[PDB]
Amino acid sequence: PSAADRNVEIWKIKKLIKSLEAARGNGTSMISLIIPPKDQISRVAKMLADEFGTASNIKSRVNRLSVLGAITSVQQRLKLYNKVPPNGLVVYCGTIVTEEGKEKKVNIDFEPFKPINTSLYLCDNKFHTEALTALLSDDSKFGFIVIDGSGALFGTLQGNTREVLHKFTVDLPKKHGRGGQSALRFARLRMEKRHNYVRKVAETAVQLFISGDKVNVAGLVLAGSADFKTELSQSDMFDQRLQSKVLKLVDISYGGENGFNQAIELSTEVLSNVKFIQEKKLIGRYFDEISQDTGKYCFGVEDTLKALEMGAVEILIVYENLDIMRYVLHCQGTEEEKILYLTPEQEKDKSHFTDKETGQEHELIESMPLLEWFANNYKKFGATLEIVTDKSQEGSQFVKGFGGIGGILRYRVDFQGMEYQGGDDEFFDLDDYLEH
RNA sequence: AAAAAUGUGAUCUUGCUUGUAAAUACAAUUUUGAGAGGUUAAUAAAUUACAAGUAGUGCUAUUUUUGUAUUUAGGUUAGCUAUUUAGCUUUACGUUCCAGGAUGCCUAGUGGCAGCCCCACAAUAUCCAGGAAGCCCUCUCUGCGGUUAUUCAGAUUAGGUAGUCGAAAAACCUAAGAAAUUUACCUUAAGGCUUCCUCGA
């Protein structure tokens, strides 16, 4: 957990994904390997050796060469490291085709950030970036509490990554005491005392959840048996404003990386559901503002860039599937530089770059996507960047008018764009000139 | 050394046994491979002096004379072996090397030899046959050499895993196996397939 250092890793990952997708390999020449942490190398190596034997049996005399080369290449890199480093390793090997019929060979190994037990090895015509994108996802990990009579274990789950933080054990007074009699329910009193310790333990677990007056995980899930967790969940000290956040309580038996794991799996599907309703709560708030007719909320692709420059927008909303990117255009005269936002249809015809309705003359030299730009620069703007999907009806509503981007203002501002959107000076060509 | 003899009762000074004092090479060969603790154990003779007993002698014990001088010297501690002739150990009797002292006897001559104490006649037993080196067994180096946790990293294999071999090796040690190899098992998803009627200036 290091500031900015994590971001650098993210940068390399996104760059890698774009390059991996661009390159296409014929046949079975493309090999992708992901090695999880605390996973023995020898099992992996043996698996690679077994794969090598299979290729020989193929008898292709063409395909076999390509398959053997890929296998041998990955093995050489594997040989260099005696024991696997924490957070695992990712290795890509194979043969790819580049511009002008040139052959390009690739050997990349690096230490991935926070990927546990991916166990992915595939033979295919292209590299798989799905594991890489998991790291990139907006949600911030899952926090799990597994509670049992004989002990308590704490850990976190991110994507398909399993983490164990810390565990401890306490004991309830199990032996009643046949020989000594108090006869009166001193034991009940003892139980009551036990009850307070269970409460305190709850209180301590909660303390773990929040550090630095902040919460470690977006969602926290607790599990247990004999209703210790249900009781555990509702108490004044235990909630710490986090009680509302927890969705499912799951009854478990024989907990100890057994049955306890099952509780985690069911809770996660629901936790994803809370995000859907969390967005909905935002939505209800959004509609109330609409009723108000303040006009504080803005819309339009160009409006958002302008909104950030102003710095008046508290919340920035973007979609992963963004159909709008930033393109720089050269005038026929060559004396003037032009900036415009283009739809995928417009983006595809790079050489003409002309709108049918007006006959506009545009030439495209270099393009910079808006999604990557907004995420990198939101901090200087002061706005908060949030990512949402169009699955929700409200998301669809944004699509009909505003588009792939959304914006929220701290204070009511008229802004610029279409007349419904704001001021009439919707577009400008000033930015292109600075670059050139 | 041989001889008057009062004597001490005429007599002798005790080879014997008993108690006291001191002689009777070291090293090598074997044996622990070595150094070496256990050279473990056990337990050995004789010559001279004193007392007792007495085997001796009467304990103690005395005189004259003779003799340069009877001084000797040499050797024995001979053994074993063979029917006989004769052969023939530095003495082992764990193994092995080396003393050999006492008694008394034979060489004081005779034959050979210049001569002799030499060879023969060499001579009878004969106390100890002693001393020395060597610990059939315990620790160290480990003499068999081994025997090990293993890491390997390799070798060897078509290659893999194991074994074997090698290597870096935790450790341990132990009374000369005089040691031996055949070593396996694992994996191959589809492999490529045609013959019709000139007998052409």
Swiss-Prot record:
Q: How is it modified after translation?
A: Methylated at Gln-181 by N6AMT1. Hydroxylation at Lys-59 by JMJD4 promotes its translational termination efficiency.
For this UniProt record, give its keywords in alphabetical order, as a comma-separated list: Acetylation, Cytoplasm, Hydroxylation, Isopeptide bond, Methylation, Nonsense-mediated mRNA decay, Phosphoprotein, Protein biosynthesis, Ubl conjugation
The cross-link described as Glycyl lysine isopeptide (Lys-Gly) (interchain with G-Cter in ubiquitin) comes at 275
Location of Phosphothreonine modifications: 343
Q: Does the keyword Ubl conjugation apply?
A: yes
Which ranges belong to the motif NIKS motif?
57-60
Subcellular location(s) per record:
Cytoplasm
Q: Which residues carry this modification: N5-methylglutamine?
A: 181
> GO terms for molecular function, please?
peptidyl-tRNA hydrolase activity; ribosome binding; RNA binding; sequence-specific mRNA binding; translation release factor activity; translation release factor activity, codon specific; translation termination factor activity
State the similarity comment: Belongs to the eukaryotic release factor 1 family.
What name appears for this protein in its UniProt entry? Eukaryotic peptide chain release factor subunit 1
Q: What is the lineage of its organism?
A: Eukaryota, Metazoa, Chordata, Craniata, Vertebrata
